[PDB]
């Protein structure tokens, strides 16, 4: 399946894929404002996640650090990203279909559209200003909002026992952003597209 990803923030952004335990495609890739970067992501992939990553350095060996969604300090993400990461997440021919949603399960950086490019289903976007809205105890000093999970590490924040409810701060997020997930059991807004959909992935697509 093909992601392109495009970063329309003013901003550069290290975009990053990964499926948890390995890269995909390349795993990552500097988009300086403007730049889009096709993927290839194999047909049948389990718990996807693309993701933005913001003030990035690295080196000629391609490691470093991000002060958002940094994936252990390298360049090409073989890992998940550190929180605060607005995450487009996707599992891909589930049963003869796919699969896609956004996320603030693990924060917010930077603001996102999800879309297919193909026909048959419809996209998802958080693009509000969560940044600059972001409660006082969610601001991350690094850049971005974190959830409450990250800041506080309770059971109830973070659903450790399964049992969990809405919270003041996940419906700082859902307010902002209806159709991302603002904690572990919020009710679902998955999207189901046909099997095998192509997506693009737009960074800041109103800003």
Do not use: H
């Amino acid at each position: 399946a093909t992601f392109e990803i495009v970063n329309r923030c003013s901003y550069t952004v290290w975009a990053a894929a990964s499926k948890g335990d390995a890269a995909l495609d390349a795993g990552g890739r500097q988009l300086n404002s403007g730049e889009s970067w096709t993927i290839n992501v194999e047909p049948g992939t389990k718990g996807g996640k693309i993701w933005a990553r913001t003030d990035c350095y690295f080196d000629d060996s391609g490691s470093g650090i991000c002060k958002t969604g940094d994936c252990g300090g390298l360049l090409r993400c073989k890992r998940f990203g550190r929180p605060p990461t607005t995450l487009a997440e996707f599992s891909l021919n589930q049963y003869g279909k796919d699969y896609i949603d956004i996320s603030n399960i693990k924060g917010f950086n930077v603001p996102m559209d999800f879309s297919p490019t193909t026909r048959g289903c419809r996209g998802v976007r958080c693009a509000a200003d969560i940044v600059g809205q972001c409660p006082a105890k969610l601001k991350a000093p690094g850049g971005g909002c974190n959830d409450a999970c990250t800041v506080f590490q309770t059971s109830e924040y973070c659903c450790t026992t399964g049992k969990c409810g809405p919270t003041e701060y996940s419906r700082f997020f859902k307010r902002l952003c209806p159709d991302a997930f603002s904690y572990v059991l919020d009710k679902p807004t998955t999207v189901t597209c046909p099997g095998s959909s192509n997506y693009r992935v737009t960074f800041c697509p109103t800003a």
